[PDB]
Every structure is written in C-alpha cells, then in structure tokens.
Amino acid sequence: VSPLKHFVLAKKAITAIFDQLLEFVTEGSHFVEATYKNPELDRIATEDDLVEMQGYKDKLSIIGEVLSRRHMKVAFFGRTSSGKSSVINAMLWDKVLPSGIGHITNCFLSVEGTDGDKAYLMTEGSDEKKSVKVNNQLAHALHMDKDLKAGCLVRVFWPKAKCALLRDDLVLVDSPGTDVTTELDSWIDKFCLDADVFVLVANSESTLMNTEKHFFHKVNERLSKPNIFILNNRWDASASEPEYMEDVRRQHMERCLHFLVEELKVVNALEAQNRIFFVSAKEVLSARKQKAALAEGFHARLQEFQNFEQIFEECISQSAVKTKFEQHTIRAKQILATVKNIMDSVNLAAEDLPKEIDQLEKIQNNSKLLRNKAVQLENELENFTKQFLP
Amino acid sequence: SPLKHFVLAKKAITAIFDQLLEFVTEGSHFVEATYKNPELDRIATEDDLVEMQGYKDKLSIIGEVLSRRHMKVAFFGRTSSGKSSVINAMLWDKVLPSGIGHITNCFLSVEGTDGDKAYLMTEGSDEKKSVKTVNQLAHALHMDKDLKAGCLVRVFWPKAKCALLRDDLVLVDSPGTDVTTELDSWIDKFCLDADVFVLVANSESTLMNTEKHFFHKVNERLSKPNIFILNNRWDASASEPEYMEDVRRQHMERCLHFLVEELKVVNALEAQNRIFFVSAKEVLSARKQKAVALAEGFHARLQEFQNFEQIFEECISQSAVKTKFEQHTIRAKQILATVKNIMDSVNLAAEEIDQLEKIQNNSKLLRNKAVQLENELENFTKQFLPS
Ligand SMILES: Nc1nc2c(ncn2[C@@H]2O[C@H](COP(=O)(O)OP(=O)(O)O)[C@@H](O)[C@H]2O)c(=O)[nH]1
Ligand SMILES: Nc1nc2c(ncn2[C@@H]2O[C@H](COP(=O)(O)OP(=O)(O)O)[C@@H](O)[C@H]2O)c(=O)[nH]1
Ligand code: BEF
Ligand code: BEF
Ligand SMILES: [K+]
Ligand SMILES: [K+]
Ligand SMILES: [Mg+2]
Ligand SMILES: [Mg+2]
Incomplete structure (x- = not known):
C-alpha cells in the first residue's frame, strides 16, 4: 500500500515545505526592501536585490498554488x-x-x-x-x-x-x-x-x-x-x-x-x-x-x-x-541558492557613529540568520528529493 | 512609348529625391544643433532629433531603391x-x-x-x-x-x-x-x-x-x-x-x-x-x-x-x-509634412537672444523649402500617376 498513498504523502510533504519557503521569502523580501529604502544606509542592499526577492515571492505563491491544486x-x-x-x-x-x-x-x-x-x-x-x-x-x-x-x-x-x-x-x-x-x-x-x-x-x-x-x-x-x-x-x-x-x-x-x-x-x-x-x-x-x-x-x-x-x-x-513536483522542487533549490547570495551580499556590504555602526551590525545579524533559515529549507528540500524522487 | 514614360519618370523622381535628401540632412543638422545647444533647452526635443535622423537614413535607402535597374x-x-x-x-x-x-x-x-x-x-x-x-x-x-x-x-x-x-x-x-x-x-x-x-x-x-x-x-x-x-x-x-x-x-x-x-x-x-x-x-x-x-x-x-x-x-x-515609385512618393509627402510640423514646433517654442530669432528665421526658411518640395512631388504625382 500503495501508489496513491505515496503521492498523497509526497503532496503533504512538499506543500508543507513550500509554505515554510513562501513565508521565508516574504520575510526576506521585507528585510531587503527595508534595508534598500532606508535613507541612512550607504547602498547596503541594491534595487536589483529587491526586485529579485519580490519576483521570488510572486513565483513561489503561484508555484504553491500549482502544488496544492487537486x-x-x-x-x-x-x-x-x-x-x-x-x-x-x-x-x-x-x-x-x-x-x-x-x-x-x-x-x-x-x-x-x-x-x-x-x-x-x-x-x-x-x-x-x-x-x-452546444460547443x-x-x-x-x-x-x-x-x-x-x-x-x-x-x-x-x-x-x-x-x-x-x-x-x-x-x-x-x-x-x-x-x-x-x-x-x-x-x-x-x-x-x-x-x-x-x-x-x-x-x-x-x-x-x-x-x-x-x-x-x-x-x-x-x-x-x-x-x-x-x-x-x-x-x-x-x-x-x-x-x-x-x-x-x-x-x-x-x-x-x-x-x-x-x-x-x-x-x-x-x-x-x-x-x-x-x-x-x-x-x-x-x-x-x-x-x-x-x-x-x-x-x-x-x-x-x-x-x-x-x-x-x-x-x-x-x-x-x-x-x-x-520535481521541476518545482529543483527551481525551489535554485531560488534558495540565489537568496543565500543576496543575504551574503548584504552581510559583506554591512562590513563597509556608534548608533550608525550598531544599526549596521543589526543588518549583519539579520542577514546571517535569514541565510541559515535558507540552508535549513535547502536541507528539507534535499530530504524530500531523497525520500520521494530518483 | 511605355519605356520612355518610365525612364522620364525615373529621372524626375530620382532628381526630386536628391533634393529631398539634402533638405532633410540640412534640417537634421539644424534640429540637432538646436536640441544640443545648452543655452536654449527646451526648444527642439530629442524625439524631433531622432525622427529627423531616421528620415535622413530612410531617404538614403529609398534613394538607392529608386535608382535600381x-x-x-x-x-x-x-x-x-x-x-x-x-x-x-x-x-x-x-x-x-x-x-x-x-x-x-x-x-x-x-x-x-x-x-x-x-x-x-x-x-x-x-x-x-x-x-x-x-x-x-x-x-x-x-x-x-x-x-x-x-x-x-x-x-x-x-x-x-x-x-x-x-x-x-x-x-x-x-x-x-x-x-x-x-x-x-x-x-x-x-x-x-x-x-x-x-x-x-x-x-x-x-x-x-x-x-x-x-x-x-x-x-x-x-x-x-x-x-x-x-x-x-x-x-x-x-x-x-x-x-x-x-x-x-x-x-x-x-x-x-x-x-x-x-x-x-x-x-x-x-x-x-x-x-x-x-x-x-x-x-x-x-x-x-x-x-x-x-x-x-x-x-x-x-x-x-x-x-x-x-x-x-x-x-x-x-x-x-x-x-x-508611388508608395515612395507618398512616404516622401508624409515625411515632408512631419518635417514642416517639427519646424513649426521649433518656431513657436522660440517664442543675446538675437540667437533665438535666428532659429526662428532658419525654421521658417526650412519650412518653405519643404513646401517647395511638396509642390514638386505634387507635380510629379500629377504628370506621372493619374488621376
Ligand atoms: N491530414 C491531416 N489533417 C489534420 C491532422 N490534424 C488535424 N487536421 C486537419 O486540420 C484542421 C485542424 O484544426 P484543429 O487543429 O482541430 O484546430 P486548432 O485548435 O487550430 O489546432 C482540421 O481541418 C483537421 O481536419 C492530421 O494529423 N493530418
Ligand atoms: N495541398 C497543397 N499542397 C501544397 C500547395 N502548395 C504547396 N504544397 C506542398 O506543400 C509542401 C511545401 O511546399 P514549399 O513550396 O516547399 O513550401 P516553402 O518551403 O514555404 O516554399 C510541398 O510538399 C508542396 O507540394 C497547395 O496549394 N496545396
Ligand atoms: F483552434 Be485554431 F488555433 F484554428
Ligand atoms: F525553408 Be521553407 F520550407 F519556407
Ligand atoms: K484550426
Ligand atoms: K518547405
Ligand atoms: Mg483547436
Ligand atoms: Mg521553399
């Protein structure tokens, strides 16, 4: 037991992963947006970073729907x-x-x-x-x-x-x-x-x-x-x-x-x-x-x-x-990889007043913690691929 | 004869297009100069310049097309x-x-x-x-x-x-x-x-x-x-x-x-x-x-x-x-009409500033050259493309 149950298990697994994914990218998108738009910060995050992350949020919502469709x-x-x-x-x-x-x-x-x-x-x-x-x-x-x-x-x-x-x-x-x-x-x-x-x-x-x-x-x-x-x-x-x-x-x-x-x-x-x-x-x-x-x-x-x-x-x-599922999980891995790069870029940019430096290290800590959430999700996707794919 | 009617037509229209191409090259240089001059922004627009440059190119290629055996x-x-x-x-x-x-x-x-x-x-x-x-x-x-x-x-x-x-x-x-x-x-x-x-x-x-x-x-x-x-x-x-x-x-x-x-x-x-x-x-x-x-x-x-x-x-x-020839002569009339509009737009926009009235005089004189060419094209169309 059985082909059908193997599928329904797979669906519940991947849909649950993508829920986590979508909230992660929405949060990261808000972080990057906030960092870019802040007039106090010397070009820490770029417009291209923001557009990419917003695009990823959209992409992921639509893919989420595709996965969950009956x-x-x-x-x-x-x-x-x-x-x-x-x-x-x-x-x-x-x-x-x-x-x-x-x-x-x-x-x-x-x-x-x-x-x-x-x-x-x-x-x-x-x-x-x-x-x-009547057609x-x-x-x-x-x-x-x-x-x-x-x-x-x-x-x-x-x-x-x-x-x-x-x-x-x-x-x-x-x-x-x-x-x-x-x-x-x-x-x-x-x-x-x-x-x-x-x-x-x-x-x-x-x-x-x-x-x-x-x-x-x-x-x-x-x-x-x-x-x-x-x-x-x-x-x-x-x-x-x-x-x-x-x-x-x-x-x-x-x-x-x-x-x-x-x-x-x-x-x-x-x-x-x-x-x-x-x-x-x-x-x-x-x-x-x-x-x-x-x-x-x-x-x-x-x-x-x-x-x-x-x-x-x-x-x-x-x-x-x-x-x-397969192609969407591959694309998920790809998007996560690029998100990691964006978070790294923001972290290093942050390395280059006391209130101003304190603000800057807060961006560093945020970017690193988002990065490791991305690696957690990469592992969950890799586990899914092992247990459900060739 | 049919053949002679054609060769007359070709010599006529090719000669008109020579005049056209020199006119638009001159107008293109004028519009370029007016647009790029830092003393007088915004008399002629970038779009005016691009259009006139495009017309110069268009006309050279059409010239070649007309003159082909x-x-x-x-x-x-x-x-x-x-x-x-x-x-x-x-x-x-x-x-x-x-x-x-x-x-x-x-x-x-x-x-x-x-x-x-x-x-x-x-x-x-x-x-x-x-x-x-x-x-x-x-x-x-x-x-x-x-x-x-x-x-x-x-x-x-x-x-x-x-x-x-x-x-x-x-x-x-x-x-x-x-x-x-x-x-x-x-x-x-x-x-x-x-x-x-x-x-x-x-x-x-x-x-x-x-x-x-x-x-x-x-x-x-x-x-x-x-x-x-x-x-x-x-x-x-x-x-x-x-x-x-x-x-x-x-x-x-x-x-x-x-x-x-x-x-x-x-x-x-x-x-x-x-x-x-x-x-x-x-x-x-x-x-x-x-x-x-x-x-x-x-x-x-x-x-x-x-x-x-x-x-x-x-x-x-x-x-x-x-x-x-016909479609090229029609396009010629169309381009001339738009050139006239550009010259009018520069003239009205123009309303030390001796320079400014010099642009006005230039734009008007170019405009009337355009009307001369419109008439020469209209004559060509009468004599070679009835009714
Ligand atoms: N000979 C041949 N005719 C075909 C074949 N498939 C479709 N047709 C014909 O070409 C037309 C096909 O239109 P159709 O493809 O159904 O509409 P579509 O939705 O625009 O592709 C019809 O007139 C069919 O009879 C084929 O494999 N061989
Ligand atoms: N049934 C039918 N077949 C045609 C007609 N015209 C061309 N074909 C065939 O369609 C195929 C493609 O013709 P061809 O002239 O090579 O297409 P071209 O490469 O677009 O020029 C050939 O096998 C022709 O015999 C037509 O009016 N009716
Ligand atoms: F159904 Be079709 F594009 F003729
Ligand atoms: F090269 Be084709 F069949 F018009
Ligand atoms: K059809
Ligand atoms: K063919
Ligand atoms: Mg159909
Ligand atoms: Mg062929």
Missing part, C-alpha cells in the same frame, strides 16, 4: 491548425471539440472525466449540464459573433467509461492558436502557463518556429522548466514524397531534440527520445470513430500515437509524484 | 505555406526546391534569359551550371559540406517559356520566416527592399503576427509595402464544404484588416484585387501536364491563380511607374 493540468499548445483540438478528439475517440480549417478554437476548453454515462458542458457560473452538442456556439469562431468578450472557459465532461485517461483528476485544455493576437496570447498565458504538462502539437508539414518555442522559455522564466511532449502532427503528409520521408523525419527529430536538450535544457537526449512523436490525429480519430486503400504508414503513425498515450498515462499516474 | 519581387511566408511551389507554378515546372519540412535554405533569384535553356550561377562565377544542380545548393535535406554565409543562387529561366520574366523582373524565393534569428536577418537583407511582395499564406491556418511583423518592418524602414496575399493550400477547403464560404470570409476579413486597417497601405476596394485563394500544387500539376478524377473547385482555384498572374503582370509592366 488536479493535473495538461495544456495543448501550438500554432493555428497544427492539430490541437483534433489530437484531443482522437484521444477521446470522437469529434467532441471544434476543429477545422481557419481559426476555430476561440475559447479555452477544460476536458475532464465524469462518472455519468453521458457527456456534457458547463459555462462560467452555471450548474446547468448543457448538451455537449460550437461557445468555442467555434465561425459560429461566435465577433463582439464576444474577454474570457472564457467552457468545461467539457466526458464519461470515464469511454476514455481510460480521464480517470482521475486529469484536466486536458484545448486553447486557441498562438501568435494570432496579443490579447489571445495573454489569455493563453493566464490559462496554460501553469500547466503541469504541455503537449506541443507541431505541424510536421512545416518546421518549428521561434514564437512556438518562446512560450516554453516564458514558462521557465515565470515558473519552472516545462514538462513537454512534442507531437509532430500531420505526418500522413509524408506518404506523398516517400523518397525524403526518413530525411524529413531526421530533420524534425534533430530540431526537436535541440529544442528540448540544448535550448531549454529540460531533458537529456535519451529522455527526449520518448517525448517526440510523429502522428496523424486525423487518421487516429477516423479509425477510432469507426469500430462501428489506406494511406501508407498509417499503422506506424497509429502505433506511435498509442505509444504517446501509454507514456503520457505513465507520467500523469505512475510517475505523478515526479511529474507534479 | 530591376523590379524585385520577394516571396515571403511561413515554412511550407507554399513559396517555392507558387514560383514553380508560375514557371510551368518544378524548378525550385519544394517539399515538407524546412527546404529552401538559401536565396534564389529567378530572371529571364534570351537563351532557350535554363541555368544557374553562384557567387561569383561565370559558369552557367545546370539548373538540375539546384538541390545541392538550395535544398536543406541535400546540402553539401559548408555552405551557409546566407547566400544567393541566381536561376535563369528562358523568356520563351514564361511571359512574366521578359522585363528586368527578378523573383526571389526565400527561406521560411521565424525559423532562426540569422535566417531572419538575411531575409531582411535580401527581401526588405523589394518593390513587390507576394505573401504566401497557409489557408489551412490563419495569419500569425510574426508574418505581419515583417511588413510593418518594411514600413518602418522604407515605405508601405505593395503586397499580394495568396491564401495557398485552398484545396484543403474541399474536405469541409459546409463551412468553405465561412472560412473564406474569415480569411478575406483578416487579410483586408491587415492591408487596410493595420498597414493602412490600401483601401478595401483595392485590397479586393490583392487577396486570392489558390492551390499552387494543383496549378503546377495541371501545367506540368503538357508536359481522371480532379478535386472541385479546382477550376475556380485555377482561374484565381490566373487572375493573380494577370494583375501581377499588369503592375510591374503597364503600371511599373506606379509600382516602382
């Missing part, structure tokens, strides 16, 4: 028409989300499991379990009037009996295309930035753009190094021009590897192997939506979608301790 | 929207590297030649190499051992085969935008100063801001860009016909908003004849069959590619005076 959030991200909606529709075995040519998905869509045997949707502040067939009115931009305003979230519920993956506490998120408008991008941040796992749906007819990559650098800048699956979707395109298939596949694989391993430095090359796939959502959906001449390599592309689903499931369940 | 048409777009394939369709053969993934990994001039065989030339080589060598130089799944520099291969296609090339026309196939920073900086160096742009958009998707940002950059550095938008891959709309008209409407509205509201380069009626829905792949396939079941509406998409080619040809031949 659910594992998976955000789907990509350019317009790479295949985000269609990938989810394939995982669900039915065309249940708005999909098509042009800009379509014009709202954010939660997808969760339900114990009931029928699907439904719910809208901002409504108990009403509306028909899943287009709310989420499909060829239906929606161009006036409709700044939000939104529509929560789709799909029966757990159909679709294994939705059990339990998993939440999939279909979003709009990146880089369509500034406002849409700011909403894509608000909704998707704090996701536990990202599925980058790339267009395998094309290659990876920098605006697509920039998002994941932003995730790291604001929170922690992102857990990323790359689906090179539309791979059925390579059935035309088989004389280059392997060369094109090699190009994508090399570029995606470079993105995860060299640019983000989130994963090593061997790990990245099991995060990059070549698939056709369209084919998988078409085949699945049928069990009451085929295009070449269909079966290979199907088997890789299945591998993606297997590995995706292995992470949000078996390795949910790792998936939910 | 050839009409350059740059093809621009995302990776795999269909740039290479559009050109391959215009030439009736698969002559340029095309395929899934990142392919076009150098810049490719395409010009007419009087000879009956096609060929290529590389920097800096007399050798007319076989057009069948292209892939080794330009196709990123092929390319031989190094290479790079961000370079140019000049393709020459027989004029006998493709009507459009017979002028001093130069088509430019480029790499995909937003792939790498260095590729983007080369795309600027090569394509930014193009006389005409063909934006090959992916009609399965919608227009991204990185795609639009390029053309804002053209405007920031030079003049509002002459832009054709080809919504390529439109054969995709065969698969989902119940929304075809709605998707078409979406693209048309977005493209219209881009040209008319965002760039403010053209009115809605003009923009109608700059936006098209086509399948390069289909057109190439049909044409290369010179050398049973076809998709609907193949024929519609073909007729629109043909309309694009007709209107494209009507512009860099019949209306070549317009195409080459």
Whole structure:
C-alpha cells in the first residue's frame, strides 16, 4: 500500500515545505526592501536585490498554488491548425471539440472525466449540464459573433467509461492558436502557463518556429522548466514524397531534440527520445470513430500515437509524484541558492557613529540568520528529493 | 512609348529625391544643433532629433531603391505555406526546391534569359551550371559540406517559356520566416527592399503576427509595402464544404484588416484585387501536364491563380511607374509634412537672444523649402500617376 498513498504523502510533504519557503521569502523580501529604502544606509542592499526577492515571492505563491491544486493540468499548445483540438478528439475517440480549417478554437476548453454515462458542458457560473452538442456556439469562431468578450472557459465532461485517461483528476485544455493576437496570447498565458504538462502539437508539414518555442522559455522564466511532449502532427503528409520521408523525419527529430536538450535544457537526449512523436490525429480519430486503400504508414503513425498515450498515462499516474513536483522542487533549490547570495551580499556590504555602526551590525545579524533559515529549507528540500524522487 | 514614360519618370523622381535628401540632412543638422545647444533647452526635443535622423537614413535607402535597374519581387511566408511551389507554378515546372519540412535554405533569384535553356550561377562565377544542380545548393535535406554565409543562387529561366520574366523582373524565393534569428536577418537583407511582395499564406491556418511583423518592418524602414496575399493550400477547403464560404470570409476579413486597417497601405476596394485563394500544387500539376478524377473547385482555384498572374503582370509592366515609385512618393509627402510640423514646433517654442530669432528665421526658411518640395512631388504625382 500503495501508489496513491505515496503521492498523497509526497503532496503533504512538499506543500508543507513550500509554505515554510513562501513565508521565508516574504520575510526576506521585507528585510531587503527595508534595508534598500532606508535613507541612512550607504547602498547596503541594491534595487536589483529587491526586485529579485519580490519576483521570488510572486513565483513561489503561484508555484504553491500549482502544488496544492487537486488536479493535473495538461495544456495543448501550438500554432493555428497544427492539430490541437483534433489530437484531443482522437484521444477521446470522437469529434467532441471544434476543429477545422481557419481559426476555430476561440475559447479555452477544460476536458475532464465524469462518472455519468453521458457527456456534457458547463459555462462560467452555471450548474446547468448543457448538451455537449452546444460547443460550437461557445468555442467555434465561425459560429461566435465577433463582439464576444474577454474570457472564457467552457468545461467539457466526458464519461470515464469511454476514455481510460480521464480517470482521475486529469484536466486536458484545448486553447486557441498562438501568435494570432496579443490579447489571445495573454489569455493563453493566464490559462496554460501553469500547466503541469504541455503537449506541443507541431505541424510536421512545416518546421518549428521561434514564437512556438518562446512560450516554453516564458514558462521557465515565470515558473519552472516545462514538462513537454512534442507531437509532430500531420505526418500522413509524408506518404506523398516517400523518397525524403526518413530525411524529413531526421530533420524534425534533430530540431526537436535541440529544442528540448540544448535550448531549454529540460531533458537529456535519451529522455527526449520518448517525448517526440510523429502522428496523424486525423487518421487516429477516423479509425477510432469507426469500430462501428489506406494511406501508407498509417499503422506506424497509429502505433506511435498509442505509444504517446501509454507514456503520457505513465507520467500523469505512475510517475505523478515526479511529474507534479520535481521541476518545482529543483527551481525551489535554485531560488534558495540565489537568496543565500543576496543575504551574503548584504552581510559583506554591512562590513563597509556608534548608533550608525550598531544599526549596521543589526543588518549583519539579520542577514546571517535569514541565510541559515535558507540552508535549513535547502536541507528539507534535499530530504524530500531523497525520500520521494530518483 | 511605355519605356520612355518610365525612364522620364525615373529621372524626375530620382532628381526630386536628391533634393529631398539634402533638405532633410540640412534640417537634421539644424534640429540637432538646436536640441544640443545648452543655452536654449527646451526648444527642439530629442524625439524631433531622432525622427529627423531616421528620415535622413530612410531617404538614403529609398534613394538607392529608386535608382535600381530591376523590379524585385520577394516571396515571403511561413515554412511550407507554399513559396517555392507558387514560383514553380508560375514557371510551368518544378524548378525550385519544394517539399515538407524546412527546404529552401538559401536565396534564389529567378530572371529571364534570351537563351532557350535554363541555368544557374553562384557567387561569383561565370559558369552557367545546370539548373538540375539546384538541390545541392538550395535544398536543406541535400546540402553539401559548408555552405551557409546566407547566400544567393541566381536561376535563369528562358523568356520563351514564361511571359512574366521578359522585363528586368527578378523573383526571389526565400527561406521560411521565424525559423532562426540569422535566417531572419538575411531575409531582411535580401527581401526588405523589394518593390513587390507576394505573401504566401497557409489557408489551412490563419495569419500569425510574426508574418505581419515583417511588413510593418518594411514600413518602418522604407515605405508601405505593395503586397499580394495568396491564401495557398485552398484545396484543403474541399474536405469541409459546409463551412468553405465561412472560412473564406474569415480569411478575406483578416487579410483586408491587415492591408487596410493595420498597414493602412490600401483601401478595401483595392485590397479586393490583392487577396486570392489558390492551390499552387494543383496549378503546377495541371501545367506540368503538357508536359481522371480532379478535386472541385479546382477550376475556380485555377482561374484565381490566373487572375493573380494577370494583375501581377499588369503592375510591374503597364503600371511599373506606379509600382516602382508611388508608395515612395507618398512616404516622401508624409515625411515632408512631419518635417514642416517639427519646424513649426521649433518656431513657436522660440517664442543675446538675437540667437533665438535666428532659429526662428532658419525654421521658417526650412519650412518653405519643404513646401517647395511638396509642390514638386505634387507635380510629379500629377504628370506621372493619374488621376
Ligand atoms: N491530414 C491531416 N489533417 C489534420 C491532422 N490534424 C488535424 N487536421 C486537419 O486540420 C484542421 C485542424 O484544426 P484543429 O487543429 O482541430 O484546430 P486548432 O485548435 O487550430 O489546432 C482540421 O481541418 C483537421 O481536419 C492530421 O494529423 N493530418
Ligand atoms: N495541398 C497543397 N499542397 C501544397 C500547395 N502548395 C504547396 N504544397 C506542398 O506543400 C509542401 C511545401 O511546399 P514549399 O513550396 O516547399 O513550401 P516553402 O518551403 O514555404 O516554399 C510541398 O510538399 C508542396 O507540394 C497547395 O496549394 N496545396
Ligand atoms: F484554428 Be485554431 F483552434 F488555433
Ligand atoms: F520550407 Be521553407 F519556407 F525553408
Ligand atoms: K484550426
Ligand atoms: K518547405
Ligand atoms: Mg483547436
Ligand atoms: Mg521553399
């Protein structure tokens, strides 16, 4: 006994550590602020120190929330028409989300499991379990009037009996295309930035753009190094021009590897192997939506979608301790290290009237005692990593 | 004749721009002197100085663009929207590297030649190499051992085969935008100063801001860009016909908003004849069959590619005076108007202090030189750009 209990122990442990962390950094932020702003002190603490510590307080509050959340959030991200909606529709075995040519998905869509045997949707502040067939009115931009305003979230519920993956506490998120408008991008941040796992749906007819990559650098800048699956979707395109298939596949694989391993430095090359796939959502959906001449390599592309689903499931369940917590604990260690440096910098600055020197040594004592609280927390995080991680 | 009308126009406008450039260099020096003078803060502002310096630069580069022997048409777009394939369709053969993934990994001039065989030339080589060598130089799944520099291969296609090339026309196939920073900086160096742009958009998707940002950059550095938008891959709309008209409407509205509201380069009626829905792949396939079941509406998409080619040809031949010069003359009028405002602002701000009235007199005399140039530009526009 048991996978579930191992997770709940881990959650209580790390959440409790992060409580201590957040109060520590808030206190240190107030100390540094006070020292910087005091007109009596010859530049003891710097503005940069203050901004960094304030940034860390914010960072840690948001990460705190992410840790304590009841659910594992998976955000789907990509350019317009790479295949985000269609990938989810394939995982669900039915065309249940708005999909098509042009800009379509014009709202954010939660997808969760339900114990009931029928699907439904719910809208901002409504108990009403509306028909899943109403989606287009709310989420499909060829239906929606161009006036409709700044939000939104529509929560789709799909029966757990159909679709294994939705059990339990998993939440999939279909979003709009990146880089369509500034406002849409700011909403894509608000909704998707704090996701536990990202599925980058790339267009395998094309290659990876920098605006697509920039998002994941932003995730790291604001929170922690992102857990990323790359689906090179539309791979059925390579059935035309088989004389280059392997060369094109090699190009994508090399570029995606470079993105995860060299640019983000989130994963090593061997790990990245099991995060990059070549698939056709369209084919998988078409085949699945049928069990009451085929295009070449269909079966290979199907088997890789299945591998993606297997590995995706292995992470949000078996390795949910790792998936939910690891990257945030690493970032916690990093932030603490920098906080220690700031406290040291303030201490040494303090070394260079009787009331004025007495005030200055009080800053020294404060900075040292904060420093050792930081080392205590570093040890508690190191213990957590030992007892709960590889 | 048409040719003589053009050469007259070129000599006229180039001569005007010489006068323009000297005027703005002088005004830039005046504004700089007034701003930097410690006796007289705050008569001219830093923003005034930066604007005037920017205008000097702008005008030098536009001067060069005006005085060039050839009409350059740059093809621009995302990776795999269909740039290479559009050109391959215009030439009736698969002559340029095309395929899934990142392919076009150098810049490719395409010009007419009087000879009956096609060929290529590389920097800096007399050798007319076989057009069948292209892939080794330009196709990123092929390319031989190094290479790079961000370079140019000049393709020459027989004029006998493709009507459009017979002028001093130069088509430019480029790499995909937003792939790498260095590729983007080369795309600027090569394509930014193009006389005409063909934006090959992916009609399965919608227009991204990185795609639009390029053309804002053209405007920031030079003049509002002459832009054709080809919504390529439109054969995709065969698969989902119940929304075809709605998707078409979406693209048309977005493209219209881009040209008319965002760039403010053209009115809605003009923009109608700059936006098209086509399948390069289909057109190439049909044409290369010179050398049973076809998709609907193949024929519609073909007729629109043909309309694009007709209107494209009507512009860099019949209306070549317009195409080459108009947008630069408009920008010239705009800059002069703002220069006038700067000189007025300095004059009013000016309201031992003999020095102060000397700035007033200088600002007024510069202002009236600006009005003289405005009239010379207005005369040019009357005589060479009706109605
Ligand atoms: N051939 C092919 N078409 C696809 C694939 N995935 C999606 N599509 C098509 O491209 C469009 C996808 O739009 P969609 O991705 O659902 O909306 P998004 O949210 O903007 O990505 C639809 O018209 C799909 O039929 C694929 O793997 N292969
Ligand atoms: N279905 C379809 N495919 C196209 C069209 N235009 C180009 N393609 C294909 O899309 C792929 C990319 O074309 P390419 O011209 O290399 O794109 P570029 O690198 O952006 O110039 C090739 O395999 C082409 O055959 C089109 O209008 N419809
Ligand atoms: F066409 Be989408 F859902 F960005
Ligand atoms: F496929 Be590209 F525009 F290099
Ligand atoms: K779409
Ligand atoms: K390509
Ligand atoms: Mg979608
Ligand atoms: Mg190309």
